[PDB]
Amino acid sequence: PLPGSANSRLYIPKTDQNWVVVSGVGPEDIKYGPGWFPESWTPEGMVPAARAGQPGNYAVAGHRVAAVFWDLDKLEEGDELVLEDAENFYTYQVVESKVVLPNAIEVIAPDPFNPESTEEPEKAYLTLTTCHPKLQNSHRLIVHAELVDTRPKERGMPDNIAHMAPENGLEH
Amino acid sequence: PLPGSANSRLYIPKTDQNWVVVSGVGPEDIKYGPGWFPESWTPEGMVPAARAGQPGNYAVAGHRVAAVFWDLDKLEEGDELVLEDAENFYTYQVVESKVVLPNAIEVIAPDPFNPESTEEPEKAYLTLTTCHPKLQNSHRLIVHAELVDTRPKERGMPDNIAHMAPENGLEH
Ligand SMILES: [Cl-]
Ligand SMILES: [Cl-]
Ligand code: NA
Protein backbone atom coordinates (compact mmCIF):
# COMPACT_ATOMS: atom_id res chain seq x y z
CA PRO A 1 0.00 0.00 0.00
CA LEU A 2 1.33 3.42 -1.12
CA PRO A 3 3.38 4.92 0.41
CA GLY A 4 4.88 1.65 1.65
CA SER A 5 8.00 2.69 3.62
CA ALA A 6 8.84 2.50 7.32
CA ASN A 7 11.24 4.51 9.46
CA SER A 8 13.37 3.15 12.32
CA ARG A 9 14.42 4.32 15.78
CA LEU A 10 18.03 4.45 16.97
CA TYR A 11 18.93 4.24 20.63
CA ILE A 12 22.37 4.82 22.21
CA PRO A 13 22.45 3.77 25.91
CA LYS A 14 25.93 5.22 26.39
CA THR A 15 24.90 8.84 25.55
CA ASP A 16 21.30 8.30 26.71
CA GLN A 17 19.92 9.39 23.35
CA ASN A 18 17.47 8.16 20.77
CA TRP A 19 15.88 9.38 17.53
CA VAL A 20 13.59 8.47 14.73
CA VAL A 21 15.94 7.92 11.82
CA VAL A 22 14.55 9.43 8.61
CA SER A 23 15.34 8.31 5.09
CA GLY A 24 17.99 10.24 3.26
CA VAL A 25 21.04 12.28 4.25
CA GLY A 26 20.38 15.49 2.32
CA PRO A 27 20.42 18.80 4.28
CA GLU A 28 16.65 18.88 4.67
CA ASP A 29 16.58 15.19 5.65
CA ILE A 30 19.01 15.48 8.56
CA LYS A 31 18.12 19.04 9.59
CA TYR A 32 16.72 17.86 12.94
CA GLY A 33 18.26 14.44 13.48
CA PRO A 34 19.90 11.40 11.89
CA GLY A 35 19.11 9.96 8.48
CA TRP A 36 19.76 6.68 6.69
CA PHE A 37 21.80 6.46 3.52
CA PRO A 38 19.29 4.88 1.07
CA GLU A 39 22.08 3.45 -1.11
CA SER A 40 25.36 1.69 -0.27
CA TRP A 41 28.53 2.23 -2.28
CA THR A 42 30.21 -0.49 -4.35
CA PRO A 43 33.01 -0.27 -6.98
CA GLU A 44 30.37 -1.12 -9.62
CA GLY A 45 27.95 1.66 -8.52
CA MET A 46 25.35 2.39 -5.84
CA VAL A 47 23.07 -0.41 -4.59
CA PRO A 48 20.03 -0.37 -2.20
CA ALA A 49 21.22 -0.16 1.39
CA ALA A 50 20.38 -2.66 4.12
CA ARG A 51 17.17 -2.00 6.01
CA ALA A 52 17.34 -2.16 9.80
CA GLY A 53 18.75 -5.43 11.17
CA GLN A 54 19.44 -6.81 7.66
CA PRO A 55 22.65 -8.11 6.00
CA GLY A 56 24.64 -5.18 4.67
CA ASN A 57 25.38 -1.78 6.14
CA TYR A 58 22.68 0.34 7.71
CA ALA A 59 24.47 3.68 7.58
CA VAL A 60 23.38 6.87 9.31
CA ALA A 61 24.52 10.52 9.01
CA GLY A 62 23.93 13.11 11.74
CA HIS A 63 25.23 16.59 12.47
CA ARG A 64 27.91 17.00 15.12
CA VAL A 65 25.59 18.96 17.42
CA ALA A 66 24.18 18.70 20.95
CA ALA A 67 20.85 17.11 20.04
CA VAL A 68 22.42 14.61 17.60
CA PHE A 69 25.94 13.19 17.20
CA TRP A 70 28.12 15.52 19.31
CA ASP A 71 29.00 12.71 21.74
CA LEU A 72 29.60 9.92 19.20
CA ASP A 73 33.29 10.01 20.17
CA LYS A 74 32.31 8.57 23.57
CA LEU A 75 31.33 5.24 22.02
CA GLU A 76 33.93 2.47 22.47
CA GLU A 77 34.29 -1.12 21.26
CA GLY A 78 31.64 -3.27 22.93
CA ASP A 79 29.08 -0.45 23.39
CA GLU A 80 25.53 -1.30 22.30
CA LEU A 81 23.40 0.52 19.77
CA VAL A 82 19.78 -0.46 19.21
CA LEU A 83 17.86 -0.12 15.98
CA GLU A 84 14.08 -0.63 16.07
CA ASP A 85 11.82 -1.44 13.10
CA ALA A 86 8.13 -2.38 13.14
CA GLU A 87 8.85 -5.95 14.39
CA ASN A 88 12.17 -6.11 16.22
CA PHE A 89 14.83 -4.52 18.33
CA TYR A 90 18.24 -5.13 16.75
CA THR A 91 21.20 -4.79 19.11
CA TYR A 92 24.51 -4.02 17.47
CA GLN A 93 27.87 -3.81 19.22
CA VAL A 94 30.53 -1.33 18.28
CA VAL A 95 33.51 -3.04 16.64
CA GLU A 96 35.35 0.08 15.44
CA SER A 97 35.51 3.84 15.74
CA LYS A 98 37.77 5.78 13.38
CA VAL A 99 38.39 9.04 11.57
CA VAL A 100 38.35 9.25 7.77
CA LEU A 101 38.41 11.93 5.09
CA PRO A 102 35.09 13.35 3.71
CA ASN A 103 35.44 11.40 0.47
CA ALA A 104 35.88 7.96 2.16
CA ILE A 105 32.61 6.70 0.65
CA GLU A 106 33.77 3.14 1.34
CA VAL A 107 32.50 3.47 4.91
CA ILE A 108 28.94 3.04 3.52
CA ALA A 109 29.76 -0.07 1.49
CA PRO A 110 27.56 -3.11 2.21
CA ASP A 111 30.55 -4.62 3.97
CA PRO A 112 32.64 -1.67 5.21
CA PHE A 113 35.45 -4.09 6.14
CA ASN A 114 35.51 -5.33 2.50
CA PRO A 115 34.34 -2.34 0.42
CA GLU A 116 35.62 -3.72 -2.89
CA SER A 117 33.30 -6.75 -2.62
CA THR A 118 30.66 -7.20 -5.33
CA GLU A 119 29.02 -10.12 -3.51
CA GLU A 120 25.83 -10.02 -1.49
CA PRO A 121 26.63 -9.18 2.15
CA GLU A 122 26.13 -11.79 4.83
CA LYS A 123 26.82 -9.84 8.06
CA ALA A 124 24.56 -7.05 9.34
CA TYR A 125 26.34 -3.84 10.24
CA LEU A 126 25.29 -0.45 11.53
CA THR A 127 27.41 2.59 10.73
CA LEU A 128 27.09 6.04 12.36
CA THR A 129 28.79 8.99 10.63
CA THR A 130 29.30 12.61 11.66
CA CYS A 131 31.63 15.56 11.16
CA HIS A 132 34.97 15.61 12.88
CA PRO A 133 36.76 17.15 14.71
CA LYS A 134 34.24 19.03 16.80
CA LEU A 135 33.43 22.38 15.15
CA GLN A 136 35.23 21.35 11.93
CA ASN A 137 34.21 19.36 8.88
CA SER A 138 37.64 18.37 7.64
CA HIS A 139 37.05 14.72 8.54
CA ARG A 140 34.35 12.20 9.46
CA LEU A 141 33.97 10.23 12.66
CA ILE A 142 32.76 6.74 11.82
CA VAL A 143 31.38 4.14 14.21
CA HIS A 144 30.85 0.64 12.82
CA ALA A 145 28.88 -1.93 14.83
CA GLU A 146 27.84 -5.52 14.17
CA LEU A 147 24.50 -7.22 14.83
CA VAL A 148 24.57 -9.35 18.00
CA ASP A 149 20.85 -9.77 18.84
CA THR A 150 17.38 -9.69 17.28
CA ARG A 151 14.56 -9.30 19.82
CA PRO A 152 10.91 -9.41 18.64
CA LYS A 153 8.98 -6.49 20.03
CA GLU A 154 6.42 -8.87 21.57
CA ARG A 155 9.06 -9.44 24.26
CA GLY A 156 9.14 -5.72 25.11
CA MET A 157 12.04 -3.27 25.11
CA PRO A 158 15.59 -4.21 26.22
CA ASP A 159 16.19 -3.09 29.81
CA ASN A 160 18.99 -0.69 28.82
CA ILE A 161 16.64 1.41 26.66
CA ALA A 162 13.26 0.88 28.37
CA HIS A 163 13.29 4.40 29.88
CA MET A 164 13.58 6.11 26.45
CA ALA A 165 9.95 6.92 25.84
CA PRO A 166 8.49 8.56 22.69
CA GLU A 167 6.28 11.66 22.71
CA ASN A 168 3.53 10.06 20.53
CA GLY A 169 4.60 5.79 14.17
CA LEU A 170 7.34 3.91 12.32
CA GLU A 171 4.76 2.71 9.78
CA HIS A 172 1.81 4.31 8.04
CA PRO B 1 31.99 14.07 0.23
CA LEU B 2 29.81 12.30 2.85
CA PRO B 3 26.90 12.80 3.10
CA GLY B 4 26.62 13.56 -0.62
CA SER B 5 22.87 13.99 -1.17
CA ALA B 6 20.78 16.94 -2.29
CA ASN B 7 17.12 17.73 -1.73
CA SER B 8 14.78 19.45 -4.22
CA ARG B 9 12.06 22.09 -4.00
CA LEU B 10 8.58 21.70 -5.47
CA TYR B 11 6.48 24.68 -6.52
CA ILE B 12 2.81 24.67 -7.56
CA PRO B 13 1.69 28.02 -9.09
CA LYS B 14 -1.95 26.96 -9.16
CA THR B 15 -2.24 26.47 -5.36
CA ASP B 16 0.50 29.04 -4.62
CA GLN B 17 2.52 26.51 -2.60
CA ASN B 18 6.04 25.23 -2.40
CA TRP B 19 8.09 22.86 -0.24
CA VAL B 20 11.46 21.31 0.22
CA VAL B 21 10.94 17.71 -0.84
CA VAL B 22 12.73 15.30 1.51
CA SER B 23 13.94 11.83 0.62
CA GLY B 24 11.70 8.95 1.54
CA VAL B 25 7.98 8.48 2.11
CA GLY B 26 7.95 6.88 5.55
CA PRO B 27 5.72 8.51 8.22
CA GLU B 28 8.61 10.43 9.76
CA ASP B 29 9.83 11.53 6.31
CA ILE B 30 6.56 13.15 5.22
CA LYS B 31 5.34 14.24 8.66
CA TYR B 32 5.65 17.94 7.70
CA GLY B 33 5.70 17.96 3.90
CA PRO B 34 6.24 15.96 0.70
CA GLY B 35 8.83 13.25 0.20
CA TRP B 36 10.36 11.49 -2.80
CA PHE B 37 10.00 7.77 -3.39
CA PRO B 38 13.67 6.60 -3.58
CA GLU B 39 12.75 3.58 -5.76
CA SER B 40 10.49 3.11 -8.80
CA TRP B 41 8.46 -0.05 -9.38
CA THR B 42 9.00 -2.46 -12.26
CA PRO B 43 7.60 -6.00 -12.86
CA GLU B 44 11.14 -7.33 -12.22
CA GLY B 45 11.61 -5.47 -8.89
CA MET B 46 12.35 -2.01 -7.49
CA VAL B 47 14.91 0.22 -9.25
CA PRO B 48 16.46 3.62 -8.33
CA ALA B 49 13.95 6.39 -9.00
CA ALA B 50 14.66 9.35 -11.25
CA ARG B 51 16.34 12.34 -9.66
CA ALA B 52 14.75 15.73 -10.32
CA GLY B 53 14.37 16.57 -14.02
CA GLN B 54 15.75 13.17 -15.14
CA PRO B 55 14.29 10.42 -17.38
CA GLY B 56 11.98 8.22 -15.34
CA ASN B 57 9.42 9.08 -12.69
CA TYR B 58 10.17 11.51 -9.89
CA ALA B 59 7.39 10.52 -7.52
CA VAL B 60 6.30 12.37 -4.40
CA ALA B 61 3.95 11.49 -1.52
CA GLY B 62 2.31 14.10 0.71
CA HIS B 63 -0.51 14.06 3.25
CA ARG B 64 -3.93 15.32 2.23
CA VAL B 65 -3.77 18.28 4.61
CA ALA B 66 -3.91 22.08 4.46
CA ALA B 67 -0.17 22.72 4.46
CA VAL B 68 0.57 19.98 1.88
CA PHE B 69 -1.57 18.23 -0.77
CA TRP B 70 -5.16 19.08 0.22
CA ASP B 71 -5.69 21.05 -3.00
CA LEU B 72 -4.00 18.64 -5.45
CA ASP B 73 -7.45 17.97 -6.96
CA LYS B 74 -7.38 21.56 -8.30
CA LEU B 75 -4.63 20.70 -10.77
CA GLU B 76 -5.82 20.27 -14.37
CA GLU B 77 -4.17 19.18 -17.62
CA GLY B 78 -1.76 21.91 -18.71
CA ASP B 79 -0.99 23.21 -15.19
CA GLU B 80 2.68 23.72 -14.38
CA LEU B 81 4.71 22.23 -11.56
CA VAL B 82 8.31 23.23 -10.93
CA LEU B 83 10.99 21.04 -9.43
CA GLU B 84 14.27 22.69 -8.44
CA ASP B 85 17.59 20.92 -7.85
CA ALA B 86 21.00 22.46 -7.20
CA GLU B 87 21.44 23.47 -10.88
CA ASN B 88 18.09 23.87 -12.62
CA PHE B 89 14.41 24.60 -12.51
CA TYR B 90 12.47 21.82 -14.26
CA THR B 91 8.97 22.78 -15.42
CA TYR B 92 6.56 19.88 -15.83
CA GLN B 93 3.04 20.10 -17.19
CA VAL B 94 0.18 18.01 -15.87
CA VAL B 95 -0.92 15.39 -18.39
CA GLU B 96 -3.20 13.34 -16.13
CA SER B 97 -4.96 13.29 -12.78
CA LYS B 98 -6.58 10.06 -11.58
CA VAL B 99 -7.74 8.03 -8.61
CA VAL B 100 -6.31 4.59 -7.89
CA LEU B 101 -6.43 1.97 -5.14
CA PRO B 102 -3.63 2.03 -2.49
CA ASN B 103 -1.94 -1.01 -4.05
CA ALA B 104 -1.63 0.54 -7.58
CA ILE B 105 2.17 0.67 -7.27
CA GLU B 106 2.39 1.00 -11.07
CA VAL B 107 1.88 4.76 -10.69
CA ILE B 108 5.52 4.99 -9.50
CA ALA B 109 6.93 2.98 -12.41
CA PRO B 110 9.70 4.75 -14.37
CA ASP B 111 7.18 5.21 -17.16
CA PRO B 112 3.75 5.28 -15.49
CA PHE B 113 2.07 5.13 -18.93
CA ASN B 114 3.98 1.88 -19.68
CA PRO B 115 4.48 0.35 -16.20
CA GLU B 116 5.18 -3.14 -17.53
CA SER B 117 8.19 -1.93 -19.58
CA THR B 118 11.58 -3.04 -18.25
CA GLU B 119 13.45 -0.86 -20.74
CA GLU B 120 15.21 2.34 -19.70
CA PRO B 121 12.86 5.33 -19.46
CA GLU B 122 13.42 8.15 -21.93
CA LYS B 123 10.76 10.65 -20.82
CA ALA B 124 10.99 12.64 -17.58
CA TYR B 125 7.85 12.55 -15.46
CA LEU B 126 6.83 14.01 -12.13
CA THR B 127 4.17 12.22 -10.10
CA LEU B 128 2.38 13.68 -7.05
CA THR B 129 0.44 11.26 -4.84
CA THR B 130 -1.86 11.82 -1.85
CA CYS B 131 -4.75 10.22 0.02
CA HIS B 132 -8.20 10.40 -1.47
CA PRO B 133 -11.03 11.24 -1.02
CA LYS B 134 -10.62 14.14 1.37
CA LEU B 135 -10.73 12.86 4.98
CA GLN B 136 -10.39 9.24 3.80
CA ASN B 137 -7.47 7.01 2.90
CA SER B 138 -9.28 4.43 0.85
CA HIS B 139 -7.70 5.61 -2.42
CA ARG B 140 -4.87 7.67 -3.87
CA LEU B 141 -5.07 10.82 -5.95
CA ILE B 142 -2.29 10.76 -8.53
CA VAL B 143 -1.12 13.64 -10.70
CA HIS B 144 1.30 12.82 -13.52
CA ALA B 145 3.16 15.61 -15.32
CA GLU B 146 5.72 15.61 -18.14
CA LEU B 147 8.93 17.65 -18.38
CA VAL B 148 8.51 20.62 -20.76
CA ASP B 149 11.42 22.92 -19.79
CA THR B 150 14.82 22.97 -18.12
CA ARG B 151 16.01 26.41 -16.95
CA PRO B 152 19.49 26.75 -15.35
CA LYS B 153 19.42 28.64 -12.08
CA GLU B 154 21.96 31.14 -13.44
CA ARG B 155 19.01 32.57 -15.41
CA GLY B 156 16.95 33.18 -12.26
CA MET B 157 13.52 31.85 -11.33
CA PRO B 158 10.58 31.37 -13.74
CA ASP B 159 8.22 34.36 -13.50
CA ASN B 160 5.32 32.27 -12.18
CA ILE B 161 7.23 31.19 -9.06
CA ALA B 162 9.56 34.17 -8.46
CA HIS B 163 7.47 35.39 -5.50
CA MET B 164 7.90 32.09 -3.58
CA ALA B 165 10.79 33.02 -1.31
CA PRO B 166 12.53 30.70 1.19
CA GLU B 167 13.21 31.55 4.84
CA ASN B 168 16.90 30.42 4.70
CA GLY B 169 20.15 24.81 1.37
CA LEU B 170 19.41 22.03 -1.12
CA GLU B 171 23.01 20.83 -0.79
CA HIS B 172 25.43 20.40 2.08
CL1 LIG C 1 37.20 16.91 18.60
CL1 LIG D 1 -12.61 14.43 -2.08
NA1 NA E 1 16.03 11.99 12.25
Ligand code: NA
Ligand atom coordinates in the same frame (compact mmCIF):
# COMPACT_ATOMS: atom_id res chain seq x y z
NA1 NA F 1 13.40 12.70 5.25
Ligand code: NA
Ligand atom coordinates in the same frame (compact mmCIF):
# COMPACT_ATOMS: atom_id res chain seq x y z
NA1 NA G 1 9.01 17.90 2.76
